[PDB]
Design a protein around this nucleic acid. Structure first.
Ligand code: MG
Ligand code: MG
Ligand code: MG
Ligand code: MG
Ligand code: MG
Ligand code: MG
Ligand code: MG
Ligand code: MG
Ligand code: MG
Ligand code: MG
Ligand code: MG
Ligand code: MG
Ligand code: MG
Ligand code: ZN
Lengths: 60, 136, 84, 177, 115
RNA sequence: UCUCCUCCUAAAGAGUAACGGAGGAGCACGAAGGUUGGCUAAUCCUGGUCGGACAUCAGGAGGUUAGUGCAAUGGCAUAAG
RNA sequence: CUCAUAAAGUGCGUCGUAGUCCGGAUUGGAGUCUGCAACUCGACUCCAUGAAGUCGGAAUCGCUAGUAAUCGUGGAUCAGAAUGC
């Protein structure tokens, strides 16, 4: 790697609100507070009619 | 009236017409009109012969024109002194050597093919004969 | 729209014709003038010719499409555009 | 390094069992990850290309190459030799760390996420995807942006076929739909 | 900070910050803050992380963003494929709820198109 | 039209004419020269954010169909690019 | 006796000049009333979205005092349906 031209790239900690703590080298500097990760996104976990509504609204 | 869509150059030398021809066999169809004399075939002459054939056969069968007029011929107008530049292109010819199958025909009986080729041979300026496809 | 407590509205002659068509199979299209009748689940798969002012437009009633009106289904104004 | 160790200990075993291979060298590897930005409005404002270079540098942790035009193009009014993009190439440790960052953090932050297309392979096993908004990477703070930009990501893989490439990414649990 | 995939404003009040979500208005924002037990005049910058997490839970209880957008698009496409009167009006880009078209109708008809 | 360059005519050494057929020049460059080290093209297909027939990225096919400061011819991979 | 709490105002707090906590058109869903029946083709309620519009060219209009301007209320017509009278 060339010297003195690359950005500062040191290891930080990212915490997600699902109780997750992970450590990654990154360039942002401070710690990270994440709204969602791969462990709590509904797509990753698996969390992702006319006659029916007619019968429900006009049951006889 | 046959003519190339474009060429590299507009004018060509006169050249010579020696030797005997290639493409001397009946290749696609069954009968052929083959040139025995040597000469040039104007695009107008080729067109007149083709029209006579197609009208004689009444648009059944298939007709192949085996020659193409790709050589331009120039002429000088009247009252122009000799020598002031090559003249302007007027028409296109196809040089013919003996044994050159000019036209060729399939899908028609032999007698009707002979009659159509006779009419077209009457329209052409050079000596022709009727030939038949041979197996080898 | 119609009140929920009054339920869905449908003409008696149309209801009887639909019932007869159900019990004796798919005949020729049911000719009707009732643009005011709502499509029920029981006439699924049926051809209803709704009067729209001069002709009877054929309608092919299916499942995903009940609960609306035959009047919605049969347009009344013929319009092809200005400057044509 | 985390996903690289994960590769070495279980992904090669999974692919061996899946495809009845004979060699761990035949078991495919992730070769490189190339990130590219086409910043073609540099012709109007060259300084915005420098902004995009700083953007890509902050995202990938690496100074980017400023890529220039291969040949002059009539419609887009660009000349040959004129800088119109930027690109980083990630190999080895930084490639694995960026790959972990992507699949763990940046992909779940995509606006309206429903999965990635499984048809995005180039017929040889290599994968390509697009990122519409670089704000999905947490390296870029929100109120310091000047223009919304994008980029595209190419995972170049030594696999021979599309089945092998998608098997490799699925073994890394890549969110395909 | 980040609610339902977008970054809400930070220097505004809680009700405006929550109604910045596509799918949350004033009434739903009051419902969110009432269910989270959070005063409506507290700004996002002075809101803590756990309060934001409860806000995320309540927003996830509601249906916002991409789910709402695709439901609206699916219903409109359902009408236009169905071919009712409203479907035809949606096809031609004209007012649907029976407004006049002899004059006005400019929201559906766009800018004026002179002959 | 008049001096100079390239092809053909020009008849397989050279040269060779016409108010014969076709095109160019009257410069550029202190790097576009020297040397050392390194590299290989055109085009098409597939995938990819804005990006579209065509910008930048990745892979394949292809094999010099590219390139040469400016015409045409002869050269060029050991590259002369 | 009912229709029928007038509103502007007043006091407090917030908003701090932004297409905004201005604007409320358009559209999706869920409803209520009247009427045999709200699709063409009613009104109103709730939720969701939030368009043009940042004071308007040439030109043109009303008003001399409880007037102009501005804010509410009622009636006729009418089963229901006023930004009109
Ligand atoms: Mg509302
Ligand atoms: Mg109306
Ligand atoms: Mg010689
Ligand atoms: Mg000689
Ligand atoms: Mg001599
Ligand atoms: Mg040179
Ligand atoms: Mg060298
Ligand atoms: Mg050199
Ligand atoms: Mg505007
Ligand atoms: Mg203002
Ligand atoms: Mg008034
Ligand atoms: Mg009254
Ligand atoms: Mg009334
Ligand atoms: Zn999480």
């Amino acid at each position: 790697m060339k010297k003195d031209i690359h950005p500062k790239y040191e290891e930080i900690t990212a915490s997600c609100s699902c109780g997750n703590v992970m450590k990654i080298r990154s360039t942002v500097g401070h710690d990270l507070n994440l709204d969602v990760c791969s462990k709590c996104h509904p797509f990753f976990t698996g969390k992702q009619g006319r006659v029916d509504r007619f019968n429900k609204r006009f049951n006889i | 009236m046959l003519q190339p869509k474009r060429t590299k150059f507009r004018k060509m030398h006169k050249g010579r017409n020696r030797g005997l021809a290639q493409g001397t066999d009946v290749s696609f169809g069954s009968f052929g009109l083959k040139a025995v004399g040597r000469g040039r075939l104007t695009a107008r002459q080729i067109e007149a012969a083709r029209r006579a054939m197609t009208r004689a056969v009444k648009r059944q069968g298939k007709i192949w024109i085996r020659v193409f007029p790709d050589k331009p011929i120039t002429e000088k107008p009247l009252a122009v002194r000799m020598g002031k530049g090559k003249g302007n292109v007027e028409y296109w010819v196809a040089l013919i050597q003996p044994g050159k199958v000019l036209y060729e025909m399939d899908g028609v009986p032999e007698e009707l093919a002979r009659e159509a080729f006779k009419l077209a041979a009457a329209k052409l300026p050079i000596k022709t004969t009727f030939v038949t496809k041979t197996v080898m | 729209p119609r009140s929920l407590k009054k339920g869905p509205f449908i003409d008696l002659h149309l209801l009887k014709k639909v019932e007869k068509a159900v019990e004796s199979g798919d005949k020729k299209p049911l000719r009707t003038w009732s643009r005011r009748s709502t499509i029920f689940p029981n006439m699924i798969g049926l051809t209803i010719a709704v009067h729209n002012g001069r002709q009877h437009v054929p309608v092919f009633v299916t499942d995903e499409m009940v609960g609306h009106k035959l009047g919605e289904f049969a347009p009344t104004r013929t319009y092809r555009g200005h400057a044509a | 390094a985390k996903l690289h160790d994960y590769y070495k200990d279980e992904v090669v075993k999974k692919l061996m069992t899946e495809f009845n291979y004979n060699s761990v060298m035949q078991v495919p590897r992730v070769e490189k990850i190339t990130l590219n930005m086409g910043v073609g409005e540099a012709i109007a404002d060259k300084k915005l290309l420098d902004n995009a270079a700083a953007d890509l540098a902050a995202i990938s942790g690496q100074k980017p190459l400023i890529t220039k035009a291969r040949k002059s193009v009539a419609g887009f009014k660009i000349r040959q030799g004129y800088p119109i993009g930027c690109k980083v190439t990630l190999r080895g440790e930084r490639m694995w760390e960026f790959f972990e960052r992507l699949i763990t953090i940046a992909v779940p932050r995509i606006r309206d996420f429903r999965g990635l297309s499984a048809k995005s392979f180039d017929g040889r096993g290599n994968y390509s995807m697009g990122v519409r908004e670089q704000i999905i990477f947490p390296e870029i703070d929100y109120d310091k942006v000047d223009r919304v930009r994008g980029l595209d990501i190419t995972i170049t893989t030594t696999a021979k076929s599309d089945e092998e490439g998608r098997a490799l990414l699925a073994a890394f649990d890549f969110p395909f739909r | 900070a980040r609610i339902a995939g977008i970054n809400i404003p930070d220097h505004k009040h809680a009700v405006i910050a929550l109604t910045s979500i596509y799918g949350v208005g004033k009434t739903r924002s009051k419902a969110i803050l009432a269910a989270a037990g959070i005063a409506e005049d507290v700004k996002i910058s002075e809101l803590s992380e756990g309060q934001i997490d409860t806000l995320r839970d309540e927003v996830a209880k509601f249906v916002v963003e991409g789910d709402l957008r695709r439901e609206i698009s699916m219903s409109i496409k359902r009408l236009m494929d169905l071919g009712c009167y409203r479907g035809l009006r949606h096809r031609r880009g004209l007012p649907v709820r029976g407004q006049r078209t002899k004059t006005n109708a400019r929201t559906r008809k766009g800018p004026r198109k002179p002959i």
